[PDB]
């Protein structure tokens, strides 16, 4: 197994950071990050919890999930697949299979003056079926106390123009003011020049995420009506 990054490096803009380039194997997560990994990416919470992310990156992921939560929190299945898209990107011990760094710049530690490398942009090979299922679970979600669709607030365009791939492309575009750096998505259910797209299992909005989480309401999910 191999990573493309590990830990945070320099400022991108605002309070947002690039991650440090790293191409070695995943590393066991410190125990102080177990609460975060349980909360965000419980699918990875087993064995040595060897991941291609550190505690800082998990904390940053949690902070950055606030706006998706703002609009999608009422439909746990919809939010679940979205969290998984980000968990795999952030932490997967097999990152190198589906991520390709495309731009870097040097990072200089201000105290030791040791150089590291900011991952400035990367390409993310996302399963076509994954992306379609993620959109499918979210597409009827209503913005809280409204009759408009939640995706119209997370897609940089109205809901009637929002589609699976342009949604993911928008969320991954730092021009949105939220993403710290741009990720360019490539959608395929098939390998691409030896890259194996991320095609994790997904949950529909009519399914329970787990034993303690109900399916989404009829208002947010026309299947359950
Ligand atoms: C994406 O899917 C992979 C493959 O199913 C998940 O990895 C498994 O997770 C379960 C639950 O902890 C473990 O029992 C297995 O040992 C894992 N399998 C392998 C082959 O790694 C992974 O959890 C999913 N990703 C996320 C973020 O949930
Ligand atoms: C404007 C709206 C639609 C944006 C909604 C999606 C936001 C929350 C997404 C887009 C890109 C995402 C980021 C992608 C990459 C990383 C690097 C990782 O090591 C820490 C988490 C972090 C920083 C993610 C947090 C969630 C994120 C900021
Ligand atoms: C998702 O796809 C199913 C069929 O797989 C369909 O019934 C439903 O209308 C779609 N949308 C939602 C919100 O689940």
From Swiss-Prot:
<feature type="glycosylation site" description="N-linked (GlcNAc...) asparagine">
    <location>
        <position position="163"/>
    </location>
</feature>
<feature type="disulfide bond">
    <location>
        <begin position="3"/>
        <end position="52"/>
    </location>
</feature>
<feature type="disulfide bond">
    <location>
        <begin position="155"/>
        <end position="162"/>
    </location>
</feature>
<feature type="binding site">
    <location>
        <position position="57"/>
    </location>
    <ligand>
        <name>cholesterol</name>
    </ligand>
</feature>
<comment type="function">
    <text>Intracellular cholesterol transporter which acts in concert with NPC2 and plays an important role in the egress of cholesterol from the endosomal/lysosomal compartment. Unesterified cholesterol that has been released from LDLs in the lumen of the late endosomes/lysosomes is transferred by NPC2 to the cholesterol-binding pocket in the N-terminal domain of NPC1. Cholesterol binds to NPC1 with the hydroxyl group buried in the binding pocket. Binds oxysterol with higher affinity than cholesterol.</text>
</comment>
<feature type="binding site">
    <location>
        <position position="19"/>
    </location>
    <ligand>
        <name>cholesterol</name>
    </ligand>
</feature>
<feature type="glycosylation site" description="N-linked (GlcNAc...) asparagine">
    <location>
        <position position="113"/>
    </location>
</feature>
<feature type="region of interest" description="Important for cholesterol binding and cholesterol transfer from NPC1 to liposomes">
    <location>
        <begin position="153"/>
        <end position="183"/>
    </location>
</feature>
<feature type="glycosylation site" description="N-linked (GlcNAc...) asparagine">
    <location>
        <position position="100"/>
    </location>
</feature>
<comment type="subunit">
    <text>(Microbial infection) Interacts with ebolavirus glycoprotein.</text>
</comment>
<feature type="disulfide bond">
    <location>
        <begin position="53"/>
        <end position="91"/>
    </location>
</feature>
<feature type="glycosylation site" description="N-linked (GlcNAc...) asparagine">
    <location>
        <position position="48"/>
    </location>
</feature>
<feature type="topological domain" description="Lumenal">
    <location>
        <begin position="1"/>
        <end position="225"/>
    </location>
</feature>
<comment type="subunit">
    <text>Interacts (via the second lumenal domain) with NPC2. Interacts with TMEM97; the interaction may decrease NPC1 availability to the cell. Interacts with TIM1. Interacts with SLC38A9; this interaction inhibits cholesterol-mediated mTORC1 activation via its sterol transport activity.</text>
</comment>
<feature type="disulfide bond">
    <location>
        <begin position="78"/>
        <end position="138"/>
    </location>
</feature>
<feature type="glycosylation site" description="N-linked (GlcNAc...) asparagine; atypical">
    <location>
        <position position="136"/>
    </location>
</feature>
<feature type="disulfide bond">
    <location>
        <begin position="75"/>
        <end position="216"/>
    </location>
</feature>
<comment type="function">
    <text>(Microbial infection) Acts as an endosomal entry receptor for ebolavirus.</text>
</comment>
<feature type="disulfide bond">
    <location>
        <begin position="9"/>
        <end position="20"/>
    </location>
</feature>
<feature type="glycosylation site" description="N-linked (GlcNAc...) asparagine">
    <location>
        <position position="200"/>
    </location>
</feature>
<protein>
    <recommendedName>
        <fullName>NPC intracellular cholesterol transporter 1</fullName>
    </recommendedName>
</protein>
<feature type="disulfide bond">
    <location>
        <begin position="218"/>
        <end position="225"/>
    </location>
</feature>
<comment type="similarity">
    <text>Belongs to the patched family.</text>
</comment>
<feature type="disulfide bond">
    <location>
        <begin position="205"/>
        <end position="221"/>
    </location>
</feature>
<feature type="disulfide bond">
    <location>
        <begin position="41"/>
        <end position="87"/>
    </location>
</feature>
<feature type="site" description="Important for cholesterol binding">
    <location>
        <position position="86"/>
    </location>
</feature>
